[PDB]
Amino acid sequence: RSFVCEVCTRAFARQEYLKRHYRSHTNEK
Ligand SMILES: [Zn+2]
Fold first, then answer.
1. How far is the CA of 12 from the centre of ligand 1 (A)?
2. What sign has the CA pseudo-torsion 1, 16, 22, 11?
3. Zn finger regions (C2H2-type) covering which residues?
């Protein structure tokens, strides 16, 4: 199954980009 960022509900082609992408959520409000 694909991978969507429960944060920005953004989907990616790979979890990698997600895991990392999450690193950009360290401070997002
Ligand atoms: Zn996100």
1. 10
2. negative
3. 3-25
Q: How many domains does the chain have?
A: 1
- Residues whose CB is less than 8 angstroms from the CB of residue 15 and which lie 6 or more positions away in sequence, other chains included: 3
| Tokens at 15, concatenated | 């979890």
Distance between Cα 1 and ligand 1 center (Å): 17
What experimental approach yielded this model?
A: NMR
Ligand 1 center to 16 CA (angstroms): 12
Which residues are near ligand 1, the ion (C-beta closer than 5 Å)?
5, 7-8, 10
